[PDB]
Write a protein that binds this ligand. Structure first.
Ligand code: SAM
Length: 246
């Protein structure tokens, strides 16, 4: 409801950065102006527009919040990409894409809404054999971690896991684990948490007295506080996978 509004004030609603999106793209080599691309849980489309400026083909951005899709389509226009890039309000667990029709499925910081292993399994049916799946997901950097952070994550995303386990689940799902890399901390600080600050000031005064808004801000500071304290134990990792049977 009012949450979309808060996030409309940021270039991105999750950890990431232009360099990271392009570094992930650097592992995808099957695209042409005939390629069909989908970006699941695209948010306002920050990473989608970056992607669109470097790869040919049509891109469909899909997101649950109508507020984000409107922003996605308006930005697309200011950029003159509305012919090959269009936002659609929908859900990643209820897609209507033709089967085995996509060359690439993109999803940054959004697969947790449906679960990693579930996403791998379900989205595979919408990809052409030899197509690509590129997703950024939360991961543990080690096998042991302090309780404070571990518990926080069980209450947010129970499916967070180490890089090795994620990689084995990818192969198990019937994909070739093409490329896997950990995101730099600036994807969390410089590009995620820092920008949320400017937004809070302005947002909080505008919605003064709103219990929802106040708790959102508390939730942000807590998450940020936890990261700068346990950043050495977790983060995001990008996973590029090619659907088997080439
Ligand atoms: C962490 S944000 C990332 C947004 C954008 N991908 C980015 O990296 O800036 C998660 C996104 O998933 C979207 N989302 C949540 N549930 C969804 C669902 N069931 N189907 C599609 N999108 C969903 C949320 O609205 C939000 O835009």
């Amino acid at each position: 409801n009012l949450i979309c509004d808060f996030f409309l004030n940021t270039e991105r609603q999750g950890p990431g950065s232009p360099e990271v999106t392009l570094k992930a793209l650097s592992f995808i080599d099957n695209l042409t102006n005939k390629s069909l691309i989908a970006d699941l849980g695209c948010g306002t489309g920050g990473q989608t527009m970056i992607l669109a400026q470097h790869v040919p083909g049509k891109i469909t951005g899909i997101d649950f919040f109508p507020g984000f899709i409107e922003r996605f389509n308006k930005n697309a226009e200011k950029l003159n990409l509305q012919n090959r890039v269009k936002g659609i309000v929908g859900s990643m667990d209820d897609l209507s894409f033709e089967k085995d029709s996509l060359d690439l499925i993109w999803s940054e910081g959004a697969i947790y809404n449906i679960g990693f292993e579930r996403g791998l399994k379900e989205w595979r049916n919408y990809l052409k054999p030899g197509g690509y799946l590129a997703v950024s997901e939360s991961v543990w950097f080690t096998d042991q971690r302090p309780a404070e952070i571990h518990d926080f994550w069980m209450s947010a995303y129970t499916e967070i896991d180490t890089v090795p386990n994620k990689v084995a689940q990818i192969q198990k799902a019937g994909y070739i684990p093409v490329a896997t890399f950990i995101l730099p901390e600036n994807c969390w600080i410089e590009h995620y948490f820092a920008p949320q600050a400017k937004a809070e000031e302005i947002f909080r005064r505008k919605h003064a007295g709103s219990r929802i808004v106040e708790e959102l801000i508390t939730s942000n500071h807590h998450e940020a506080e936890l990261y700068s304290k346990y950043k050495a134990y977790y983060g995001y990792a990008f996973f590029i996978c090619k659907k088997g049977f080439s």
